[PDB]
Design an enzyme around this catalytic site. Structure first.
Site, PDB file in Angstrom:
ATOM      1  N   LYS A  87      -4.112 -24.447  -8.807  1.00  0.00           N
ATOM      2  CA  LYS A  87      -4.323 -25.438  -9.867  1.00  0.00           C
ATOM      3  C   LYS A  87      -3.551 -25.186 -11.172  1.00  0.00           C
ATOM      4  O   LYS A  87      -3.375 -24.045 -11.597  1.00  0.00           O
ATOM      5  CB  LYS A  87      -5.818 -25.544 -10.187  1.00  0.00           C
ATOM      6  CG  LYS A  87      -6.664 -26.064  -9.038  1.00  0.00           C
ATOM      7  CD  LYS A  87      -6.292 -27.499  -8.704  1.00  0.00           C
ATOM      8  CE  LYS A  87      -7.085 -28.025  -7.517  1.00  0.00           C
ATOM      9  NZ  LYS A  87      -6.754 -27.300  -6.256  1.00  0.00           N
ATOM     10  N   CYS A 109     -12.924  10.386 -26.307  1.00  0.00           N
ATOM     11  CA  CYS A 109     -12.297   9.254 -26.977  1.00  0.00           C
ATOM     12  C   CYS A 109     -11.007   8.954 -26.265  1.00  0.00           C
ATOM     13  O   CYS A 109     -10.475   9.798 -25.550  1.00  0.00           O
ATOM     14  CB  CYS A 109     -11.961   9.605 -28.427  1.00  0.00           C
ATOM     15  SG  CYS A 109     -13.351  10.080 -29.429  1.00  0.00           S
ATOM     16  N   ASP A 167      -0.383  13.667 -18.679  1.00  0.00           N
ATOM     17  CA  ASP A 167      -0.488  13.552 -20.134  1.00  0.00           C
ATOM     18  C   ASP A 167      -1.232  14.729 -20.775  1.00  0.00           C
ATOM     19  O   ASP A 167      -1.277  14.862 -21.996  1.00  0.00           O
ATOM     20  CB  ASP A 167      -1.037  12.180 -20.585  1.00  0.00           C
ATOM     21  CG  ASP A 167      -2.548  12.067 -20.483  1.00  0.00           C
ATOM     22  OD1 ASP A 167      -3.196  12.963 -19.915  1.00  0.00           O
ATOM     23  OD2 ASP A 167      -3.094  11.047 -20.967  1.00  0.00           O
ATOM     24  N   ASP A 177      -4.192 -16.731 -13.408  1.00  0.00           N
ATOM     25  CA  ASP A 177      -3.739 -18.092 -13.123  1.00  0.00           C
ATOM     26  C   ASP A 177      -3.178 -18.251 -11.708  1.00  0.00           C
ATOM     27  O   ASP A 177      -3.269 -19.328 -11.115  1.00  0.00           O
ATOM     28  CB  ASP A 177      -2.694 -18.550 -14.150  1.00  0.00           C
ATOM     29  CG  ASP A 177      -3.270 -18.703 -15.546  1.00  0.00           C
ATOM     30  OD1 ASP A 177      -2.582 -18.327 -16.520  1.00  0.00           O
ATOM     31  OD2 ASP A 177      -4.411 -19.200 -15.672  1.00  0.00           O
ATOM     32  N   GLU A 192      -2.923   0.589 -18.199  1.00  0.00           N
ATOM     33  CA  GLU A 192      -1.586   0.925 -18.676  1.00  0.00           C
ATOM     34  C   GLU A 192      -0.927  -0.357 -19.177  1.00  0.00           C
ATOM     35  O   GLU A 192      -0.886  -1.355 -18.460  1.00  0.00           O
ATOM     36  CB  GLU A 192      -0.741   1.548 -17.557  1.00  0.00           C
ATOM     37  CG  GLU A 192       0.609   2.092 -18.027  1.00  0.00           C
ATOM     38  CD  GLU A 192       0.456   3.364 -18.858  1.00  0.00           C
ATOM     39  OE1 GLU A 192      -0.278   4.268 -18.417  1.00  0.00           O
ATOM     40  OE2 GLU A 192       1.066   3.462 -19.940  1.00  0.00           O
ATOM     41  N   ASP A 240       5.019 -20.385 -18.804  1.00  0.00           N
ATOM     42  CA  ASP A 240       5.164 -19.137 -18.055  1.00  0.00           C
ATOM     43  C   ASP A 240       6.024 -19.356 -16.824  1.00  0.00           C
ATOM     44  O   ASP A 240       6.411 -18.406 -16.140  1.00  0.00           O
ATOM     45  CB  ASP A 240       3.811 -18.622 -17.571  1.00  0.00           C
ATOM     46  CG  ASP A 240       2.893 -18.192 -18.701  1.00  0.00           C
ATOM     47  OD1 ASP A 240       3.363 -17.877 -19.813  1.00  0.00           O
ATOM     48  OD2 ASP A 240       1.676 -18.148 -18.457  1.00  0.00           O
ATOM     49  N   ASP A 246      18.100 -21.800 -13.255  1.00  0.00           N
ATOM     50  CA  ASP A 246      18.975 -21.219 -14.253  1.00  0.00           C
ATOM     51  C   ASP A 246      19.323 -19.876 -13.646  1.00  0.00           C
ATOM     52  O   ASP A 246      18.737 -18.821 -13.958  1.00  0.00           O
ATOM     53  CB  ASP A 246      18.047 -21.015 -15.481  1.00  0.00           C
ATOM     54  CG  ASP A 246      18.579 -20.037 -16.527  1.00  0.00           C
ATOM     55  OD1 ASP A 246      19.797 -19.989 -16.773  1.00  0.00           O
ATOM     56  OD2 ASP A 246      17.738 -19.340 -17.148  1.00  0.00           O
ATOM     57  N   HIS A 254      -3.813  15.291 -14.806  1.00  0.00           N
ATOM     58  CA  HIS A 254      -3.001  14.246 -15.428  1.00  0.00           C
ATOM     59  C   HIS A 254      -1.764  14.809 -16.131  1.00  0.00           C
ATOM     60  O   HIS A 254      -1.876  15.757 -16.911  1.00  0.00           O
ATOM     61  CB  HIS A 254      -3.821  13.480 -16.465  1.00  0.00           C
ATOM     62  CG  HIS A 254      -5.035  12.801 -15.908  1.00  0.00           C
ATOM     63  ND1 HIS A 254      -5.950  12.149 -16.712  1.00  0.00           N
ATOM     64  CD2 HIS A 254      -5.487  12.664 -14.640  1.00  0.00           C
ATOM     65  CE1 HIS A 254      -6.910  11.640 -15.962  1.00  0.00           C
ATOM     66  NE2 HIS A 254      -6.657  11.943 -14.699  1.00  0.00           N
ATOM     67  N   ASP A 286      -7.387   5.944 -19.601  1.00  0.00           N
ATOM     68  CA  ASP A 286      -7.401   6.182 -18.146  1.00  0.00           C
ATOM     69  C   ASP A 286      -7.380   4.965 -17.220  1.00  0.00           C
ATOM     70  O   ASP A 286      -6.817   5.009 -16.125  1.00  0.00           O
ATOM     71  CB  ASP A 286      -8.559   7.097 -17.765  1.00  0.00           C
ATOM     72  CG  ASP A 286      -8.319   8.526 -18.190  1.00  0.00           C
ATOM     73  OD1 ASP A 286      -7.142   8.933 -18.210  1.00  0.00           O
ATOM     74  OD2 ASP A 286      -9.296   9.229 -18.517  1.00  0.00           O
ATOM     75  N   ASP A 297      -1.169 -14.987 -22.357  1.00  0.00           N
ATOM     76  CA  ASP A 297      -0.012 -14.130 -22.612  1.00  0.00           C
ATOM     77  C   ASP A 297      -0.438 -12.670 -22.730  1.00  0.00           C
ATOM     78  O   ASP A 297       0.199 -11.876 -23.420  1.00  0.00           O
ATOM     79  CB  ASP A 297       0.799 -14.592 -23.825  1.00  0.00           C
ATOM     80  CG  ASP A 297       1.575 -15.869 -23.550  1.00  0.00           C
ATOM     81  OD1 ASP A 297       1.623 -16.294 -22.374  1.00  0.00           O
ATOM     82  OD2 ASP A 297       2.144 -16.443 -24.504  1.00  0.00           O
TER      83      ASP A 297
END
Ligand code: CA
Ligand code: CA
Ligand code: CA
Ligand code: CA
Ligand code: CA
Ligand code: CA
Ligand code: CA
Ligand code: CA
Ligand code: CA
Ligand code: CA
Lengths: 662, 662
Positions: free
Chosen positions: A167, A641, A467, A162, A348, A176, A122, A465, A345, A383
């Site tokens: 396989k 945290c 951030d 995968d 992502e 997928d 396609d 960093h 950390d 997924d």
């Protein structure tokens, strides 16, 4: 459109397969007996024949008695528009004559079997496999662009990725994969000496895999026919109109040295003799581009909020829960060996997309060998994909953490649109000898191309960093956004005002018992001369970044808000937060989780909190301050945290972009 | 156009260098004393100042008494259009006021030194270095394209290539180099704490080198300031209007992994303090593309004819001399250890070009270790360049010889123009397990990009070279050309005619005494059944090539002439010439040196010679048959002489092409 050479043979009949979409030019002169003068021809109803003299073509009847002079420059052009059946006799016969007499002195002939062979994908990117798209053999960017798209199969159907093997197990897995169909039309069998073969290059063999689903007696079966250590597969021909359905998977993301483009071929091969290779008679090619890994800026709708903390940090959990309950998002909580910030950390959230399907994919930060060795695969599942890049000879540093990896909202810069935004990563000045994210990760991000990465300067920070000093927030009710920048000058202005106001003895870190003996007030802060000089210098570092961001993101001062921040210099001349960095915040649309600063209390409210509210709230942003440090009783510059938000993908399709030539 | 952040500092004066072409945004709020309400400003004549409130800018007088409310969102925009001199005092001063009273309570100020800094190259490709081309930082293809061009310095000024080291000796050498000029304007010295630094990336350090020419007391001196193991150079600043002239050389051709693009930077750096890296204040960048190696098709004007043979092959030398004397070309003759064909097989003449200069460059074929080890450097000299590619782990085969490397005339295919033609190299079918030119050489040719290489099928030949079966010739008096193809069917047709004519006993190889005992006639040839079958098969191989050439070169049957040829199969099922291959010929415009075939004599002329003349002469091509085999007394399928023609470059500039995205 493609012309193929097929000569008559002197004295002997020639049998050939004719592939629809091509046509033959046929030398009749070589096969003529010596002394022959003229020739005539006959042909069957489904074969079109033209006599071509010096470029001038004349169509010829099925039985003519017409005769032409034999010349090197007088040839035939042979065309068929429909495949042979069992009822076909498709042929051209040429008779030769000498000067004297009208009875043929010899005959040469061409017997044809026409078949259709097309390898289809396609290419027009609607999710359905069209018949023989003329553009299927190339790949072009943009709204008018064409060519097929392949997903890396990085997730895991049944509890490594995968694609780590050859396989296939379950039917869900095939979803997928991109479909590729070999469409053929012809008689009951191929003529003797022919076979059809699918193949790929050795180079592409670690980039792709191809499966065929067969439905034998005892159940559905998935055979891996092309891929690692299989470069070719002989196809079983079936007559009439037939279709063979294949499923294709990508094994590798674009990277340094790999553009993302791969090819698959089918050829009709002709057997010559033993020890002589088979001649490809006809070859059809399709190209796939492997879809790039794409990140999500804070402006995109949040889906799930992931957090990690210790089990007993109760306030943090209650307050994060409270925040998320204001939204439609789901909360996911984890309490691993080490890496208190790991959710922020070490991972992502990003995504991949093809016309038929897409799914989130997690990138995993490089292992140092000190703290992190074990990859984080706990998130690998159906997924939900996984990918990683490990440096070979290069040492990992703090700048490899994904607190150092962020992405801007969609921007236009110098008239060039970046509809997916631009990736931002912290670095050091070129001549500095400072830290930099590992080349392998930088190369990966650059290779995805659609986020056009930009390096900022993070190396002035101990942790290093991006951030820590910057973030983006949407402006509610609009299509716009703001850049938020940490500012030490804003903090000093604010504290100097409160001091002038008679608040100099206002204490910070109220309620953190481990900080009490330090008795840190506004007066104490403002009277520290070396700390002032440190923070002037840090403001210079922030402003250098401000300038890079305005230039590379096409931002003006109207797009920026400054949040008060303060740092202390370490022995390396790098900054660590003096009080929690408020800029690193949880953005869920209009609702912002903001780290609680524990600033000086004036009239029983934190003056830092009140100041931040006064900047943000007028824009319709709702602020919730979240306390991650009380459970620890003190703040030394580190936060224990972490949070990471998984977002919906951009509605803009990556394949509609047109990246700059590389 | 670029906005830079410079803040006033609370209580203290700020001194800054201002680089022309940028402008400053200046926060006056942070520097305001606590309790301050309004501010006013003064500025010098050469500094333009705007007060900016929420995007609205108002220009302000040198001395106003005007006062504005202090706000975070009220800032200054500072612009200068001319560099500072020693007579300059360039400054902005801000006064702060409290509620009560009109006398300033404090002052903050900005003292500026404006300088111009531009790193300039000839981006517009006219050979002269223009002032600050706004496009100098990118590189674009085509007639409208821009950005500077660099030549690989592969030749040798003084009797390895010049680029093999970091040294420059003579002034002539600088002519191969592209000029880069650092233009500055400013006062007598830079203010304290600043320096100007040129630099390149570690990655580019083996792609380039940069020299500065200084003229000290005892003579001209060339200093290598950037390149291998030098990544940066601190520039000596001189005041007033100054220019520093640098010369840049490329060290490497485009290749696998290297696009051909390199960058050079200049930065103004600011000293912070010990142990703290210097801040780049301003950075200017120029991009170079290294010019690709380009080959020359047979249609281009010949300059020099190189030949190699043994000293005693007299006829060959006399006949080649005769041929060249019909032209304006010069003859160069060589008699080396081995490689009788080496001039043809071991070298390919090509060229490089930049707007300011160009010169021929010789590519040297890979060393096998059996025959060739020694590179051929004998041709390395002034304005004759040298380059080579050696396989690391890959074995060399006959397909690595440059008899296997040719190039087409300019062609248009499917509407896409290839103004430099397309490179042609022989290979084997993909699934064949056959021979192929080494990847390192293929990668090199592909990386040049402007000749868009195409693989033909040569592996059916024992030697395996495309030049055995095909060549191109111009059509005199026109802009067109023909493809010439070896044809066995043409040979059999011709011999069958001569036999019919009563010439079956006509003998070949007349005058070669070592062939006499074989007594090879037309009858003997035609009656050999296995030889007929071998040659039908070889004609199939030729026709497969014919189809590839017509497709990839956009050719029709009108563009092709077939020359009679004949082969014998070896034990590997590969072809060797039965009589010399006439297609491999010396093309000097209308004059063709054609290998003498030694075919059957009819009426005391070679019927192969007469047949070739009858095909070519009507087109205005003049044929001279050149005998390279008589000195050897026999022909076994190998030719012991070689020729290579050095040609004038295309008049079309390579940088005006627009190659497909890779
Ligand atoms: Ca479709
Ligand atoms: Ca699998
Ligand atoms: Ca899967
Ligand atoms: Ca899946
Ligand atoms: Ca991140
Ligand atoms: Ca110029
Ligand atoms: Ca040198
Ligand atoms: Ca030189
Ligand atoms: Ca030179
Ligand atoms: Ca050659």
């Amino acid at each position: 459109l493609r012309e193929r050479t097929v000569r008559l043979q002197y004295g002997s009949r020639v049998e050939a397969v004719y592939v629809l979409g091509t046509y033959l030019w046929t030398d009749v002169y070589s096969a003529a007996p010596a002394g022959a003068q003229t020739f005539s021809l006959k042909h069957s109803e489904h074969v079109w024949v033209e006599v071509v003299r010096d470029g001038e073509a004349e169509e010829v009847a099925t039985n003519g008695k017409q005769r032409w002079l034999l010349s090197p420059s007088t040839t035939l052009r042979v065309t068929m528009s429909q495949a042979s059946t069992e009822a076909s006799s498709d042929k051209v016969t040429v008779n030769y004559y000498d000067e004297e007499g009208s009875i043929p002195i010899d005959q040469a002939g061409l017997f044809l079997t026409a078949i259709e062979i097309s390898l289809d994908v396609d290419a027009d990117r609607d999710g359905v496999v069209e018949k023989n798209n003329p553009k299927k053999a190339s790949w072009t960017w943009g709204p008018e662009g064409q060519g097929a798209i392949l997903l890396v199969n990085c997730d895991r159907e049944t509890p490594k990725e995968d694609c780590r093997d050859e396989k296939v197990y379950s039917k869900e897995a095939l979803k997928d994969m991109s479909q590729m169909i070999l469409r053929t039309k012809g008689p009951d069998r191929l003529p003797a000496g022919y076979e059809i073969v699918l193949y790929i290059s050795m180079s592409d063999s670690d980039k792709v895999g191809v499966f065929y689903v067969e439905n034998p007696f005892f159940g559905q079966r998935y055979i891996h026919i092309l891929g690692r250590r299989k470069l070719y597969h002989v196809v079983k021909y079936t007559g009439g109109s037939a279709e063979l359905l294949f499923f294709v998977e990508g094994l590798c993301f674009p990277d340094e040295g790999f553009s993302g483009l791969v090819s698959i071929h089918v050829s009709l091969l002709e057997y010559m003799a033993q020890d002589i290779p088979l001649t490809p008679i006809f070859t059809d090619t399709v190209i796939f581009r492997i879809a790039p890994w794409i990140m999500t800026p804070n402006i995109l709708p949040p889906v799930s909020v992931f957090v990690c903390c210790m089990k007993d940090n109760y306030l943090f959990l209650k307050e994060v829960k409270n925040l998320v309950e204001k939204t439609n998002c789901e909360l996911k909580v984890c309490f691993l060996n080490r890496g208190d910030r790991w959710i922020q950390d070490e991972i992502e959230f990003g995504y991949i997309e093809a016309p038929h399907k897409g799914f989130p994919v997690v990138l995993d930060s490089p292992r140092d060998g000190n703290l992190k060795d074990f990859p984080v695969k706990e998130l690998l599942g159906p997924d939900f994909g996984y990918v990683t890049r490990e440096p070979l000879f290069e040492s990992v540093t703090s700048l490899d953490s994904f607190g150092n990896l962020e992405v801007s909202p969609p921007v236009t810069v110098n008239g060039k649109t970046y509809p997916l935004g631009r990736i931002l990563i912290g670095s050091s000045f070129p001549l500095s000898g400072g830290r930099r994210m590992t080349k392998v990760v930088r190369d990966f991000l650059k290779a995805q191309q659609v986020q056009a990465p930009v390096e900022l300067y993070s190396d002035w920070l101990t942790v290093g960093h991006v951030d820590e000093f910057m973030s983006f927030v949407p402006i509610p009710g609009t299509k716009k956004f703001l850049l938020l920048m940490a500012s030490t000058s804003a903090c000093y202005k604010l504290f100097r005002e409160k001091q002038k106001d008679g608040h100099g003895e206002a204490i910070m870190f109220k309620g953190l018992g481990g900080m009490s003996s330090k008795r840190i007030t506004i007066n104490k802060i403002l009277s520290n001369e070396s700390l002032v000089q440190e923070n002037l210098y840090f403001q210079r570092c922030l402003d250098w970044n401000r300038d890079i961001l305005k230039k590379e993101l096409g931002l003006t001062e109207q797009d920026i808000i400054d949040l008060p921040a303060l740092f202390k210099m370490d022995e390396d001349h790098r900054a660590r937060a003096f009080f929690p960095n408020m800029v690193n915040m949880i953005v869920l649309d209009k609702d912002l989780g903001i780290p609680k600063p524990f600033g000086p209390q004036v009239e029983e409210e934190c003056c830092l909190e009140m100041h931040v509210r006064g900047l943000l709230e007028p824009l319709g942003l709702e602020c919730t301050f979240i306390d991650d440090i009380s459970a620890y009783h003190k703040f030394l510059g580190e936060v224990h945290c972490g949070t990471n938000v998984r977002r919906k993908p951009f509605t803009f399709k990556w394949w509609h972009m047109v990246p700059s030539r590389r």
